[PDB]
Amino acid sequence: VAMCFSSYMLAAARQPNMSAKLLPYCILGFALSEALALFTLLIALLELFVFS
Amino acid sequence: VAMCFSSYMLAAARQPNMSAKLLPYCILGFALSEALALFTLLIALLELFVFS
Amino acid sequence: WDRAQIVYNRYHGAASQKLAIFNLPKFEDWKQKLEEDSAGDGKIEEDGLLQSLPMKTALGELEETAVEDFYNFHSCLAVLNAVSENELSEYAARIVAVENQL
Amino acid sequence: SWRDAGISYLRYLSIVTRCIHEVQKEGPLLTKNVRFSTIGWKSLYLDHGATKEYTAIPAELEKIPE
Amino acid sequence: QDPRKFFPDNGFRFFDGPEDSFGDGNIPAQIILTLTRQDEFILKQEPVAAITIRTNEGEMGVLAGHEYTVQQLAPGILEVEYEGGKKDQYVISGGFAHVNDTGVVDINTVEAVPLEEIDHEKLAKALEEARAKSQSPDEAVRIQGEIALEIFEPLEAALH
Numbered sequence: 001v002a003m004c005f006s007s008y009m010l011a012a013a014r015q016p017n018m019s020a021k022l023l024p025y026c027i028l029g030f031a032l033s034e035a036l037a038l039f040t041l042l043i044a045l046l047e048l049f050v051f052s
Numbered sequence: 053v054a055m056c057f058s059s060y061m062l063a064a065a066r067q068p069n070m071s072a073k074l075l076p077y078c079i080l081g082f083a084l085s086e087a088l089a090l091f092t093l094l095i096a097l098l099e100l101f102v103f104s
Numbered sequence: 105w106d107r108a109q110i111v112y113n114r115y116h117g118a119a120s121q122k123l124a125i126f127n128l129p130k131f132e133d134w135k136q137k138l139e140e141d142s143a144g145d146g147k148i149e150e151d152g153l154l155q156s157l158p159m160k161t162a163l164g165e166l167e168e169t170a171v172e173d174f175y176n177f178h179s180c181l182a183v184l185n186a187v188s189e190n191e192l193s194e195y196a197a198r199i200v201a202v203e204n205q206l
Numbered sequence: 207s208w209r210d211a212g213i214s215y216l217r218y219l220s221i222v223t224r225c226i227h228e229v230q231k232e233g234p235l236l237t238k239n240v241r242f243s244t245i246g247w248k249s250l251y252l253d254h255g256a257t258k259e260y261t262a263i264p265a266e267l268e269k270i271p272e
Numbered sequence: 273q274d275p276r277k278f279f280p281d282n283g284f285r286f287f288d289g290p291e292d293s294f295g296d297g298n299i300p301a302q303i304i305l306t307l308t309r310q311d312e313f314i315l316k317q318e319p320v321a322a323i324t325i326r327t328n329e330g331e332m333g334v335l336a337g338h339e340y341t342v343q344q345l346a347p348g349i350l351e352v353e354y355e356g357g358k359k360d361q362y363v364i365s366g367g368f369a370h371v372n373d374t375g376v377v378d379i380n381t382v383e384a385v386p387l388e389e390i391d392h393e394k395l396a397k398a399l400e401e402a403r404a405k406s407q408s409p410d411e412a413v414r415i416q417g418e419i420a421l422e423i424f425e426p427l428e429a430a431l432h
Contacts, residue, residue: 001088005081006059009074013066014161016143019073030084037088044095066164069143114283123280154289158340158373170344173215177368180216181310181380185283188311208415215366221416222347222423223365223383229395229427230363230385239383242310268412 001037004030056081106130108179112186113193119200121193126182131175138163212270221267292340292372299337300375302355307362309384314362323377324351325369326426336375343369345381347419348426361387363427392431399424 008026012019060078064071107129114124129137138160146157163171208218224243230236245267251260263271305323307315324333326348345367352360367381402424405417 002053002056002081002085005077006055008077009059009063010066012074013063013070014165015158016067016070016073017145017157023077030081034084034088041088041091067139067143069139111280112283114281114286123278124283124286125280126283152285154291156292158292158294159342159370162340162342166342169209169215173344174342174368176214176216177380184311189283208419211411211415213415218419219366219382221419225398225420225423226363226365226383226385229398229424230390231394233389235385235389239385242383268416 001030001033004033053082053085056085106133110183110186112190113197114189115192115196118196121197124189126186128179128182131172134175135171212272213267217267224267290372290374290376292374292376295373301336303334303336303338303375303377305352305377306379307384308378308380310382314384319355320352320377321355322353324353325379326350327369334371334377337373338371338375340373341369341371345369345379346426347423349387349430350379350384361430363387363390365423387430390427395424395427395431399428 004026008022011022056078060071060074063074067074107127110126110128112124112126114122116122141157142160142164146155148155163174166174220243227236227240227243230239245265247265249260249263249265250257252258302319302321303323305315305318305320307313322333322335324331326332326346328344328346345364347366348364350362350364352362354360362384363386364381365383367379370378370380398420402417402420405413406421408414408417
């Protein structure tokens with residue numbers, strides 16, 4: 001998740017005029033990289049409050 | 053977290069004047085990178101002081 | 105020096121030896137102009153002026169010693185073109201100021 | 207190395223060019239291009255009425271300006 | 273007085289540089305090369321298929337629409353390859369390669385000589401001259417020998 005913004009800063013520095021073009025291609029994976037964490041975290045949340 | 057601040061530093065070394073407009077994405081990747089650490093820390097404490 | 109104006113004679117033709125100039129900014133000031141330009145959008149502020157944003161960013165990646173060689177190099181070529189053009193203008197207008205003496 | 211010795215990148219290029227002109231074969235190309243490496247210029251600064259050489263920068267490439 | 277009788281034109285305007293665009297189309301099929309030594313060009317906007325440079329970081333190669341870049345040239349050889357499969361080598365003395373995303377090459381150098389006008393025999397003596405200069409302990413001659421060897425060794429390996 002941090003890697004996406006980490007590379008976004010590098011590409012924004014290489015061509016700041018592409019920053020507007022690049023943030024749509026940055027938030028997508030940023031969520032979809034974070035999304036697995038939710039899928040990884042929901043398990044731990046689902047593992048206790050429903051199991052006997 | 054260190055990857056995000058290392059990106060902010062190398063970006064400022066690549067584009068100093070851009071450092072202000074890249075900073076909201078550095079704080080955003082810092083916060084959301086720390087969020088999963090926060091939930092991970094939350095679970096270990098929610099594992100003990102409530103369970104028998 | 106803060107700005108170096110090279111002056112020379114431009115040979116447009118055998119009957120045309122006019123003046124011409126090169127305006128050289130300072131190295132530090134040229135790098136500050138390059139850093140200020142590399143951020144904002146690329147727009148030409150003068151008719152006939154070429155855009156240079158992709159160059160100013162590729163140079164922005166370029167290290168210190170190489171950018172200093174880029175500056176001293178291209179300023180050396182500018183000076184050399186001034187010499188070759190004034191040499192040609194000397195050998196071009198002298199013939200007119202010789203046949204008029206005759 | 208040669209960088210920190212005090213010589214410039216321009217003296218470096220001119221030295222390399224002066225070396226390359228030696229090795230190339232003899233012909234009209236060398237007969238012309240040796241002009242592009244021979245050192246014959248000088249410097250002068252005017253006194254009150256007399257001429258004097260501003261020798262703060264040598265023309266030879268081996269030396270170091272100071 | 274007269275109000276500025278003279279008006280010298282900015283000499284930069286006489287040159288017609290490219291307008292490097294971000295690209296709203298395809299890439300060209302062959303680079304447009306333009307080699308220039310001190311003032312005069314040897315090659316002006318020739319269509320060429322490929323080119324291989326020697327730089328300080330290493331040895332590079334280029335094709336049409338290569339990424340926008342600018343960099344030094346190590347004192348050595350330069351290889352060029354036309355669309356007809358042939359080749360052209362040029363010994364160079366430093367310079368600056370200016371590659372573009374549109375596909376354009378502006379290699380500004382100090383010297384540019386073909387290989388045909390060079391003899392290994394004359395280079396041979398200059399080798400041990402450079403070695404003696406490097407081994408002669410003196411800051412004025414040591415670096416001169418290191419640089420002379422820096423320019424002969426690429427030629428020494430290119431000839432063999």
